[PDB]
C-alpha cells in the first residue's frame, strides 16, 4: 500500500509544497505563436517565462491520479495571449478537471473531429475536459492566471500532434478578447 | 464518434456549492450505527436530527479514464465527544485513488487499509490530500465552522459503504481538551 499524504497549496502563489517544479519560457515554444517575428524578438529581448508547473505525479497506473498547479504569466506574443503548449492524452480516452484559483483566462479545447470550444475561467471556475479533447490554457489578464489540474495517472501526454497541426483557433486581443481561426492550422 | 461537450461550472468558495450539481443530504438519522455514543446519537436525532453533511456532485457515466468531482459541506458538531464525520467508504473498484482539496474550515481525513492500518491527515484551507488506491477514507470536522472541500475521483471508482457501515473504522476522532485519534472499541 502506498502512503497517503497531504501537501499545502498556497492560494496566492499557486505553489504546491513538495511539488516538482517545471519552467517554460518563450524559447521553449517555437512554432506555437502565430507572430513568428514578435516571438523571435521577445526571445532575444529576454526570453520571458510563460508558465511554471508544480506537479505531484504517481507512476503510470489505471485508476490512479496526478495533480498540479500552473502559474501562467500575463503577456502577449504580438497580440496573442500567453498560453500553455496544449496537448492530448497518450490514452486520448482520459478526461481531466481544472479548478481556477487566481487571475483570469480561459481554456481552448479541440476534438480530433475538429470541433473547437473556448471556456472562460475565473477563480472558482471548474472546467470539465472530456475524453478525446485536446486542451490549452490562456491568460487573458494582466496578472498571473493560476489553476489546479487533476488527471488520470495513466493519461500520458501527446504534444506532437499539436506542435504539428496546431489548434484550429487562436486567442487574441483586439480591444477585447477575440477567438478567431488559426491560419496555419 | 460523437464526443461529450466540455463545460465550466462555478464553485462558490464560501458556500461550497457547485452550480448545476446533484445535491445529496445526510442527516444524523442517515448514519445510524456510525457513532460510538448511540445514546447521544438517539437524543440528537429526536432533538432535531441535524444535517451532518451535504454533497454537490457532477458525475459522468462509470467509464474507464473519466472523472467525477464533488464538494462536501461537513457541518460542525459532535455526537457525545465524537466529531461530525462522513460515513466513509472504499471505492467499488478498490484500487482507484482520490484527491481532496480543502477550501474552508478545519478538519482532517481518516484513512485505513482493508486490514485496519490507519492514518490521520489534518486539513485546513489549501490542503491537498492524496487518497491512495486501496484505502478507505472518512472526513472529519474538528472545528466550529463548516468544513468545506472538493474531491476528485475516477468515474468508475464506485462506492463501497457496506464494510464500514458494518464494522466502522478501526479508529475514532474525538475531543478531549483537544483533537485525539483513539482506537474504535466496537471495531
Ligand atoms: O498534465 C498536467 O500536468 C496538467 O494538464 C497541467 O499541469 C498542464 O501540463 C500545464 O498547464 C502545462 O500545459 P501543457 O502541459 O498543456 O503544455
Ligand atoms: O464519491 C464522492 O462523491 C466523494 O468521495 C465525496 O463527495 C464523498 O462522497 C463525501 O465526502 C461524503 O462522504 P461519503 O460518500 O463517504 O459519505
Ligand atoms: Fe469516492
Curated annotation (Swiss-Prot), chain B:
Subcellular location(s): the record lists:
Cytoplasm
Q: Which cofactor does it need?
A: Fe cation
> Which residues are recorded as binding Fe cation?
89, 91, 98, 137
Q: What is the effect of changing residue 137 to A?
A: Loss of catalytic activity
GO molecular function terms noted in the UniProt entry: glucose-6-phosphate isomerase activity; iron ion binding
What biological process terms from GO does the record include? Answer: gluconeogenesis; glycolytic process
Asked if Isomerase is a keyword of the record, the answer is yes
- Positions of disulphide bridges: none
Report the superkingdom from the record.
Archaea
Which keywords does this Swiss-Prot/TrEMBL entry list?
Cytoplasm, Gluconeogenesis, Glycolysis, Iron, Isomerase, Metal-binding
Q: How is its activity regulated?
A: Inhibited by mannose 6-phosphate, fructose 1-phosphate and fructose 1,6-bisphosphate. Its activity is also inhibited by Cobalt (II) ions < EDTA < nickel (II) ions < zinc (II) ions << cadmium (II) ions < copper (II) ions. Sodium and potassium ions and manganese ions show little or no effect on activity.
**What effect on the protein does mutating residue 91 to A have, as reported in its record?**
Loss of catalytic activity
Return the broad EC class. isomerase
One Pfam family matching this protein: GPI
Q: Does the keyword Transmembrane apply?
A: no
Subunit comment: Homodimer.
In Swiss-Prot or TrEMBL terms, this protein is called Glucose-6-phosphate isomerase
Amino acid at each position: 500500500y502506498k502512503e497517503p499524504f497531504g501537501v499545502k497549496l498556497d492560494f496566492e502563489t499557486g505553489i504546491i509544497e513538495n511539488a516538482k517544479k517545471s519552467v517554460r519560457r518563450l524559447s521553449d515554444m517555437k512554432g506555437y505563436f502565430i507572430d513568428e517575428e514578435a516571438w523571435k524578438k521577445m526571445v532575444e529581448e529576454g526570453d520571458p517565462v510563460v508558465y511554471e508547473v508544480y506537479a505531484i505525479e504517481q507512476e503510470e497506473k489505471e485508476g490512479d491520479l496526478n495533480f498540479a498547479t500552473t502559474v501562467l504569466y500575463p503577456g502577449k506574443v504580438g497580440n496573442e495571449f500567453f498560453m500553455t503548449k496544449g496537448h492530448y492524452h497518450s490514452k486520448i480516452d482520459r478526461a481531466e478537471v481544472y479548478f481556477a484559483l487566481k487571475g483570469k483566462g480561459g481554456m481552448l479545447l479541440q476534438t480530433p473531429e475538429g470541433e473547437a470550444r473556448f471556456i472562460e475561467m475565473e477563480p472558482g471556475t471548474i472546467v470539465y475536459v472530456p475524453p478525446y479533447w485536446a486542451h490549452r490554457t490562456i491568460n487573458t489578464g494582466d496578472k498571473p492566471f493560476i489553476f489546479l489540474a487533476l488527471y488520470p495517472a495513466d493519461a500520458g501526454h501527446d504534444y506532437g500532434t499539436i506542435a504539428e497541426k496546431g489548434f484550429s483557433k487562436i486567442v487574441v486581443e483586439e480591444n477585447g478578447k477575440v477567438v478567431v481561426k488559426d491560419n496555419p492550422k
